[PDB]
Design a protein around this ligand. Structure first.
Ligand code: CLA
Ligand code: CLA
Ligand code: CLA
Ligand code: CLA
Ligand code: CLA
Ligand code: CLA
Ligand code: CLA
Ligand SMILES: CCCCCCCCCCCCCCCC(=O)OC[C@H](COP(=O)(O)OC[C@@H](O)CO)OC(=O)CCCCCCCCCCCCCCC
Ligand SMILES: CC1=C(/C=C/C(C)=C/C=C/C(C)=C/C=C/C=C(C)/C=C/C=C(C)/C=C/C2=C(C)CCCC2(C)C)C(C)(C)CCC1
Ligand SMILES: CC1=C(/C=C/C(C)=C/C=C/C(C)=C/C=C/C=C(C)/C=C/C=C(C)/C=C/C2=C(C)CCCC2(C)C)C(C)(C)CCC1
Ligand SMILES: CC1=C(C/C=C(\C)CCC[C@H](C)CCC[C@H](C)CCCC(C)C)C(=O)c2ccccc2C1=O
Ligand code: SF4
Ligand code: SF4
Lengths: 732, 31, 91, 193, 64, 80, 152
């Protein structure tokens, strides 16, 4: 035996394929030699512990570097006129102009400007000095050490959990719902009330005095007597200055709604009340399922009894408890789908309802956060469907799942796939046709012939929320409606003030260009879903390959017979859907960035007029906004944007290098490598050296992955460079 | 400070060399 | 301004309703939805040592078998209702 | 038959009281579902045959229509009235508490019954005058009860709908409006504005 | 005689077959007892291999 | 070595054993088809995984199947 | 005023667009003799531009802040000519084409070699079938009622 230890088949490969495939199959515990279920579960547990340790170390490193090399104490005094510092630069390759150019902020040497928004987040939660950040970093280092220690302990024979413990679903659901959500959110309200709210009013509360300072003048008396309205009295005034006692109040729980007048962000007393309410809701809900105390629900009986008596769903949900409980890919897919949905929601909500002070005025940070979270959500959404296909291949049992909801989906896969195809074709046809018609109309110098369609439904929905720029006068926009009268004394004043102010990002005004780009987004989503669903459902076989389940999740082809069978596996269906995900997220981020750039420059009419034809996009977004970026270094000198131009070109080069592995396939290269072996063996003074692994071309599936990684890395780096350079050159 | 003048070369030139040598010796080993 | 000490009499009413009215319905529904099980075996009998029911807490000398868990659950419901009533007033 | 010349569903044989084969959507196909539906229909009919006297009589005595009697509870501190006399306990949280407890007991008592016949016509103590002594008269009585209940349900639907077209008005007010000028004060104007 | 008579129309009940749930015509039936798939069926449409004839057992064809 | 399997839907055409570029497959006598023959796969250590045998099979779905498996010097076609 | 829009006839930006287009066209005409053919073509272009702007003014379209017409597709009766009527006409034509294709495909399905009638069209049969699609809605609906629309 030799590397890999966990594969007898791989360890006997006489070629270089032994190393590549040894690296790529390390974390697939199910396919290792002499693997059992208990060992699988225990390895997963240890890996989770390691992941937590890595996360804690990452956060500790960020905090330590900001405390040691940043300008946090200078930024706190004048947040709007200081640039945050990420860390310092020490590059022996730098020249003197590079040393001078990157010396920005208040530093004594080259530094990097942070665009992750950690400064605003930490300032909002009450951190004020570099001593606080050092303590936080030390605490997180301790937490990482504790996580590693806990990871090592449960791999010992005395402390190994059993498989039955891992399959106790009701106890885990109860404990997670009640403590990991309810108690976790209850404690954050405590931190807010005791530390963060006093800090925003000029009060310094730390470990040495937090037992003597009352968060409220009346103490806990109102809480136990039910006089809970005393905690909302005397809120902060509109003339409040954040961080000082000028114009401050004494309330700790309010329902004002809207934004803080100065920081242009949510009130700190609204978030505490929100977290308290959700903590109570989560604490109550964690008492549903049955444990060894003799009361509660049983999930299996809940599933088995939800069958309609009409028979239109067959046997219903019977047998689904054991299907989910015995498959880990099913659980991973469900978790990934939920996580991706909530990540997209986080991205959509953070840009329009900012929570951190002075982050709405930082234009570069907002775009970076939005793009980051949207790309991550897209990748997670692809992974959900990938693991659904893996479940259908490896874990599904037809006999236990007879005629239930899961089995009837495989029965009519053709209808689902064909209807998805119809929707995609319809959307693509008409969207492209309208765009090309508008382009041709602009080309002939007659813009009045364009097809411009108002997004009436979205404008009506915006009016129903209290916006008065369209004159629809419905619901919340109606002063005499019951809905308006219900909340007019609680939250409507502040919300209506915020929604009818046009300098923020709360319910931006929309037009025909928004309509066209929204339908493009819909086309992208439908096509990606079509690809992934077709890959998942056809995983066990089709007419072209009835026995696909016998060949695994990933395999090259079934050869040139029967007309040829390239890309017939479900893995190849996942591989083709990454290109569509990247395209869709690119469209979404292009739309967001152009709209917000035009909004920030105060010339929204440019987007309104130039977004109805594709030449408008190409000329007024890409060509126009890339002038500063491509001038980072020129024959006349360099400035602080040099690194972003270099990364722009680097991303272009990495993206194009991926096309080599995607367009040219293996048999060209194995023949080319065969001549080099002869050349080396016949060369004097060099044939005294010989290899140990026989050199070979990459495998058919390897080159698909290697090409796709190059494509994604180039995409990400190029867009990140362009976005950051374009935003920071104009707005700093 | 003077610390970056040490740790940057330590992490960029010394540790990669040690790790690559050890890993190559590990992957080339047989019994 | 209703007093908080009196309003907590809702606990007594909730306990009365649980002990005299809805006892049979709750008991028969709990009997119908048995212990959770995996692969046809309960969690404890499948191998999980920490899933064993506490039989010592099931035995109560009440003539109809009223437990302490029932007391806790109905008291929690009564307290929640009473504090909702208290918070709704004085607004 | 509810429509001559139309075939009947197989499960509607014409032996049940008030059975005329009306089931275009086939909601009674499942034998367990159809048994429940008869109980629900009878309960709805019996509840609606008490509402109709309770809506017209207070309006016929000048005490206000049936939607005016609910206006006071939306206000803070509103007190209930009966026959023009305020009742001491007519506060909102006193009324809500006594209604839930009194009803939750009887309906749960009805729920625990397991004999299908007693869920519709329980008999026993609820028939003090003994009208169920004759099985021959009883069938005629059941037909009469079913035929009246559906009419009362239709009347209640009319009550509800007529309110939307004429807000703030009572059914007797609508009848008085119609009687004065039948040929212009009718449904036609509402449908075609 | 064994199985369907020649010229009759049968439908296929083999899941891994290209003509699953399709109707074909019987050509011949081998009468040897030791043969496992004695029914010869032909179809109007060709499969992915441009073949139009296949052999089936008595349990994978039914008279339509 | 790769895995080559034969199923009893075989008709004895010989076309798979004529197509193999290395001697992996051969005909043996049998009873169960008109031809009184079936393919056998005695030498799968010499299989390269080309699937020429599966392109030649006239059965609706193949009576010969090749499953790719652990790779060796012979199965990679290396003459280095 | 749906969505805060204004009629084209009252829009000043619409008139400014018309004036700019006409002025751009007129600057090219000064380069040619009035009797020459290019002058005649430019005159025709100017007249057509004026007529197009007048026609857009007459039909009751709605302009935005840029002076460009916008289409309302919510179903309002005042703008049924923008989306509803052309949509119904397109649906009729597409149903005609699809019904004719389906009828021709069914007609030749019973032949000895139906494939050869697809690469070499049988002109008389198609010509006889072409006229039949003029009443496609009635035939399709009656086929749906009789259950012959969906294959068994
Ligand atoms: C995350 C995580 C999870 C899911 C577990 C889960 C478990 N640990 Mg554990 N552990 C963790 C982190 C975690 N640990 C860390 C980080 C450390 C290092 C401090 C330890 C150190 C540790 C020890 C030293 C032991 C366990 C043991 C156990 C097992 C039963 C005892 C128990 O926790 O119930 C506690 C049950 C209760 C009723 C406590 C309720 C809390 C009261 C009400 C307050 C259980 C499988 C025990 C065992 O037998 O392992 C098999 C054991 O001896 N753990
Ligand atoms: C009170 C009891 C309790 C608690 C606290 C935990 C806690 C945990 N268990 Mg656990 N467990 C328990 C009882 C408990 N268990 C019992 C009784 C059993 C046996 C039935 C188990 C069995 C068990 C297993 C088998 C495993 C765990 C694991 C875990 C860890 C998962 C990490 C996680 O959820 O990320 C934290 C996530 C959240 C807090 C919520 C994420 C989603 C929310 C909505 C996001 C909120 C975002 C919010 C806006 C803030 C973000 C913004 C901010 C950046 C500013 C976590 C530490 C896993 C593990 O190994 O971890 C080490 C694991 O594999 N547990
Ligand atoms: C919580 C998140 C999570 C977890 C625990 C897993 C866990 C797993 N995934 Mg996975 N996956 C995820 C998210 C996740 N995935 C997402 C979001 C995607 C979409 C991008 C995928 C796409 C994906 C594919 C396409 C495949 C897996 C596979 C696997 C299994 C083997 C992993 C392996 O060999 O990698 C080893 C590590 C590497 C190869 C390094 C990756 C190198 C890349 C190019 C960048 C560096 C393992 C059970 C494999 C599997 O189960 O095969 C049957 C498999 O083929 N995953
Ligand atoms: C810009 C490049 C591009 C374009 C235009 C498309 C377009 C399309 N892809 Mg696609 N794709 C691309 C790149 C592209 N892809 C890449 C890089 C990948 C990764 C490998 C994929 C992977 C992919 C998958 C996996 C799938 C698609 C599908 C589709 C189709 C669904 C969208 C739709 O509604 O049709 C848009 C309509 C059109 C483009 C029609 C234009 C027709 C004009 C009029 C042709 C004119 C002809 C000519 C001018 C006249 C004769 C003259 C003579 C000289 C020819 C669509 C045709 C899906 C599909 O086919 O299923 C439905 C599908 O499943 N694509
Ligand atoms: C499958 C096609 C499809 C898809 C996926 C979408 C998707 C979307 N549309 Mg949309 N739309 C469609 C067709 C479609 N539309 C058509 C055909 C019209 C013209 C009537 C519109 C008109 C329209 C408007 C005016 C607006 C949207 C908007 C939106 C977005 C918000 C969701 C919404 O309001 O749904 C709307 C859903 C529908 C209208 C249902 C259409 C589905 C049917 C099956 C289409 C069939 C065509 C039908 C036969 C036409 C008959 C007309 C004939 C009598 C003349 C969402 C991305 C809104 C938005 O945010 O834009 C920025 C918005 O304001 N759409
Ligand atoms: C995952 C967290 C993380 C990350 C990404 C970095 C990243 C970096 N650190 Mg670092 N560091 C970390 C945690 C982290 N550190 C921790 C926990 C400590 C201990 C408190 C340090 C202590 C540290 C010092 C003392 C120095 C760096 C330096 C650097 C930079 C040059 C690389 C180097 O010399 O590595 C060294 C990394 C370590 C010693 C961490 C070991 C754990 C680089 C940006 C150097 C720098 O600023 O260059 C300009 C430098 O001089 N780091
Ligand atoms: C069973 C259904 C039902 C319900 C819910 C009500 C409910 C109500 N009735 Mg009522 N009523 C009913 C049946 C019902 N009635 C019947 C069958 C009759 C005919 C005898 C009446 C005759 C009647 C009169 C004459 C008056 C009311 C009034 C009222 C209102 C306040 C006092 C009262 O009677 O409380 C319900 C308690 C016992 C029925 C209340 C909304 C009073 C009113 O107008 O309120 C302002 C009033 O003056 N009812
Ligand atoms: C006139 C032309 C037909 C119009 C109706 C077309 C739909 C079919 C008939 C529905 C008539 C009907 O009630 O069908 C009921 C039918 C069967 O429901 P169940 O199996 O749950 O119950 C069956 C019992 O009601 C039988 O007694 O379909 C459904 O599952 C519900 C569909 C509507 C769901 C609505 C809520 C969705 C969220
Ligand atoms: C394949 C497969 C799989 C996977 C799957 C998936 C991945 C899916 C996804 C899915 C999804 C991803 C879904 C989603 C959904 C969503 C939703 C369903 C939503 C909803 C919403 C709502 C309902 C709302 C509401 C509201 C309110 C409340 C208020 C305001 C207004 C509104 C309307 C907004 C599994 C593993 C499982 C199994 C195997 C196979
Ligand atoms: C001996 C006896 C008797 C009596 C008895 C009794 C009297 C009992 C009682 C009992 C009780 C009396 C119980 C209680 C309980 C309670 C509870 C269980 C509570 C809970 C609570 C909670 C859960 C809370 C919550 C919350 C919320 C939700 C919010 C705010 C905060 C708080 C925390 C407050 C008699 C003579 C008759 C007979 C013979 C025997
Ligand atoms: C270029 C090319 C080759 C030839 C390329 C080879 C053999 C590259 C082999 C790797 C060399 C030595 C460069 C490695 C560069 C890495 C950055 C170093 C390792 C990094 C570690 C993290 C693994 C194929 O083998 C091939 C096979 C099938 C389809 C397409 C292609 C294809 O396009
Ligand atoms: S394996 Fe295929 S090609 Fe070879 S004899 Fe059998 S049926 Fe003929
Ligand atoms: S796969 Fe190729 S080498 Fe292997 S037995 Fe078949 S024809 Fe021969």
């Amino acid at each position: 035996l030799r590397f890999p230890r966990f594969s007898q088949g791989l360890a006997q490969d006489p070629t270089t394929r032994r190393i590549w495939f040894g690296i790529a199959t390390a974390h697939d515990f199910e396919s290792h030699d002499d693997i059992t279920e208990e060992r699988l579960y225990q390895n997963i547990f240890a890996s989770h512990f390691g992941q937590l340790a890595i996360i804690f170390l990452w956060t500790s490193g960020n905090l330590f570097h900001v405390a040691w090399q940043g300008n946090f104490e200078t930024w706190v005094q004048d947040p709007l006129h200081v640039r945050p510092i990420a860390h310092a630069i020490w590059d022996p390759h730098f020249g003197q102009p590079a040393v001078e150019a990157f010396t920005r902020g208040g530093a004594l040497g080259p530094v990097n400007i942070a665009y992750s928004g950690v400064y605003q987040w930490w300032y909002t939660i009450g951190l004020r000095t570099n001593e606080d950040l050092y303590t936080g970093a030390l605490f997180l280092l301790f937490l990482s050490a504790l996580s590693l220690i806990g990871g090592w302990l449960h791999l010992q024979p005395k402390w190994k959990p059993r498989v039955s413990w891992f399959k106790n679903a009701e106890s885990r659901l109860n404990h997670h719902l009640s403590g990991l959500f309810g108690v976790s959110s209850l404690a954050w309200t405590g931190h807010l009330v005791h530390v963060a709210i006093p800090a925003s009013r000029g009060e310094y509360v730390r470990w040495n005095n937090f037992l003597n300072v009352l968060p409220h003048p009346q103490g806990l008396g109102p809480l136990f007597t039910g006089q809970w309205n005393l905690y909302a009295q005397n809120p902060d005034s509109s003339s409040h200055l954040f961080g000082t006692s000028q114009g401050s109040g004494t309330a700790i729980l309010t329902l004002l709604g809207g934004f803080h007048p100065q920081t242009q962000s949510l009130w700190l007393t609204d978030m505490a009340h929100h977290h308290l309410a959700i903590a109570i809701l989560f604490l109550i809900a964690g008492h549903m399922y049955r444990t060894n105390f003799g009361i509660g629900h049983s999930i299996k009986d809940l599933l088995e009894a939800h069958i309609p008596p009409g028979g239109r769903l067959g046997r219903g949900h019977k047998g689904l408890y054991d299907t989910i409980n015995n498959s880990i890919h099913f659980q991973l897919g469900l978790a990934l789908a939920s996580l991706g949905v909530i990540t997209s929601l986080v991205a959509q909500h953070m840009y329009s309802l900012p929570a951190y002070a002075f982050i709405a005025q930082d234009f570069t940070t907002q775009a970076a956060l939005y793009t980051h979270h949207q790309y991550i959500a897209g990748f997670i959404m692809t992974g959900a469907f990938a693991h659904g296909a893996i479940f259908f291949i490896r874990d599904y049992n037809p006999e236990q799942n007879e005629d239930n909801v899961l089995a009837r989906m495989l029965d009519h896969k053709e209808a689902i796939i064909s209807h998805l195809s119809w929707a995609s074709l319809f959307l693509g046809f008409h969207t492209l046709g309208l765009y090309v018609h508008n382009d041709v109309m602009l080309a002939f110098g007659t813009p009045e012939k364009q097809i411009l369609i108002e997004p009436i439904f979205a404008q009506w929905i915006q009016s129903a929320h209290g916006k008065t720029s369209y004159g629809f006068d419905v619901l919340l926009s109606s002063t005499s409606g019951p809905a308006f009268n219900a909340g007019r004394s609680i939250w409507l004043p502040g919300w209506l003030n915020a929604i009818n102010e046009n300098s923020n990002s709360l319910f931006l005004t929309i037009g025909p260009g928004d309509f066209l780009v929204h339908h493009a987004i819909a086309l992208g989503l439908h096509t990606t879903t079509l690809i992934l669903v077709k890959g998942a459902l056809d995983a066990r076989g089709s007419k072209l390959m009835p026995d696909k389940k016998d060949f695994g999740y990933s395999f090259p082809c079934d050869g040139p017979g029967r007309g040829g069978t390239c890309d017939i596996s479900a893995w190849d269906a996942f591989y083709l859907a990454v290109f569509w995900m990247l395209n869709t997220i690119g469209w979404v981020t292009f739309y967001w960035h152009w709209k917000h750039i035009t909004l920030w420059q105060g010339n929204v009419s440019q987007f309104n007029e130039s977004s109805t034809y594709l030449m408008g996009w190409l000329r007024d977004y890409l060509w126009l906004n890339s002038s500063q970026l491509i001038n980072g270094y020129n024959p006349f000198g360099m400035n602080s944007l040099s690194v972003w131009a270099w990364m722009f070109l680097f991303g272009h080069l990495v993206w194009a290098t991926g096309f080599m592995f995607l367009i040219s396939w293996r048999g060209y290269w194995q023949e080319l490598i065969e001549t080099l072996a002869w050349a080396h063996e016949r060369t004097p003074l060099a044939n005294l050296i010989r290899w140990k692994d026989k050199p070979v071309a990459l495998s058919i599936v390897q080159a698909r992955l290697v090409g796709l990684a190059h494509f994604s890395v180039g995409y990400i780096f190029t867009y990140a460079a362009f976005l950051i350079a374009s935003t920071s050159g104009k707005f700093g | 400070n003077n610390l970056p003048s040490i740790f940057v070369p330590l992490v960029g030139l010394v540790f990669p060399a040690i790790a690559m040598a050890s890993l190559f010796l590990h992957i080339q080993k047989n019994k | 301004l209703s007093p908080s000490i009196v309003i907590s009499l809702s606990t007594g009413l909730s306990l009365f309703l649980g002990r005299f009215v809805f006892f049979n319905f709750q008991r028969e529904n709990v009997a119908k939805q048995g212990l959770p099980e995996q692969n046809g075996k309960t969690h404890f009998e499948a191998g999980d040592d920490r899933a064993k029911e506490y039989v010592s807490l099931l035995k109560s000398n009440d003539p109809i078998g009223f437990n302490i868990v029932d007391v806790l659950a109905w008291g929690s419901i009564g307290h929640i209702v009473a504090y909702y009533i208290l918070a709704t007033s004085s607004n | 038959h509810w429509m001559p010349g139309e075939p009947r569903p197989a499960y509607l044989d014409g032996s049940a009281p008030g059975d005329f084969g009306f089931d275009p959507l086939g909601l009674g196909e499942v034998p367990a579902n159809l048994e429940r539906y008869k109980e629900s229909e009878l309960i709805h009919c019996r509840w609606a045959m008490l509402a109709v006297p309770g809506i017209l009589v207070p309006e016929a005595l000048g005490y206000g229509n049936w939607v005016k009697a609910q206006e006071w509870a939306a206000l803070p501190g509103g007190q209930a009235t009966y026959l023009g006399n305020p009742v001491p306990w007519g506060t909102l949280p006193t009324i809500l508490a006594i209604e839930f407890l009194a009803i939750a007991f009887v309906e749960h008592q009805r729920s625990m019954e397991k004999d299908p016949e007693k869920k519709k016509y329980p008999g026993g103590a609820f028939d003090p005058l003994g009208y169920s002594k004759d099985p021959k008269k009883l069938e005629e009585l059941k037909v009469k009860e079913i035929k009246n209940g559906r009419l009362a349900l239709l009347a209640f639907v009319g009550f509800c709908v007529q309110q939307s077209a004429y807000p703030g008005t009572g059914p007797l007010e609508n009848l008085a409006t119609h009687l004065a000028d039948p040929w212009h004060n009718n449904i036609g104007d509402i449908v075609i504005p | 005689p064994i199985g369907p008579k020649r010229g009759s129309k049968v439908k296929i009940l083999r899941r891994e077959s290209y003509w699953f749930k399709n109707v074909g015509s019987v050509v011949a039936v081998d009468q040897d007892p030791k043969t496992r798939y004695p029914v010869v069926v032909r179809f109007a449409k060709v499969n992915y291999a441009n073949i139009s004839t296949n052999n089936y057992a008595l349990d994978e064809v039914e008279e339509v | 070595s790769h895995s080559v399997k034969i199923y009893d839907t075989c008709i004895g055409c010989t076309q798979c054993v004529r197509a193999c570029p290395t001697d992996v497959l051969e005909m043996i006598p049998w009873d169960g088809c008109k031809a009184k023959q079936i393919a056998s796969a005695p030498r799968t250590e010499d299989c390269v995984g080309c699937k020429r045998c599966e392109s030649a099979c006239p059965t609706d779905f193949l009576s010969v199947r090749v499953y790719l498996w652990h790779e060796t010097t012979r199965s990679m076609g290396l003459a280095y | 005023d749906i969505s805060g829009l204004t009629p084209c006839k009252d829009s000043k930006q619409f008139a400014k667009r018309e004036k700019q287009q006409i002025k751009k066209l007129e600057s090219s005409l000064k380069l040619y003799a009035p009797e020459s053919a290019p002058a005649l073509a430019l005159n025709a272009q100017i007249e057509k531009t004026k007529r197009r702007f007048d026609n857009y003014g007459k039909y009751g379209l709605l302009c935005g802040s840029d002076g460009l017409p916008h289409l309302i597709v919510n179903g309002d009766q005042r703008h049924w000519g923008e989306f509803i009527t052309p949509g119904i006409l397109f649906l009729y034509i597409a149903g005609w084409i699809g019904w004719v294709g389906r009828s021709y495909l069914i007609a030749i399905s019973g032949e000895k070699k139906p494939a050869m009638k697809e690469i070499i069209i049988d002109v008389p049969l198609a010509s006889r079938i072409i006229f039949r699609g003029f009443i496609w809605p009635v035939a399709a609906y009656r086929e749906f009622l009789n259950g012959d629309l969906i294959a068994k």
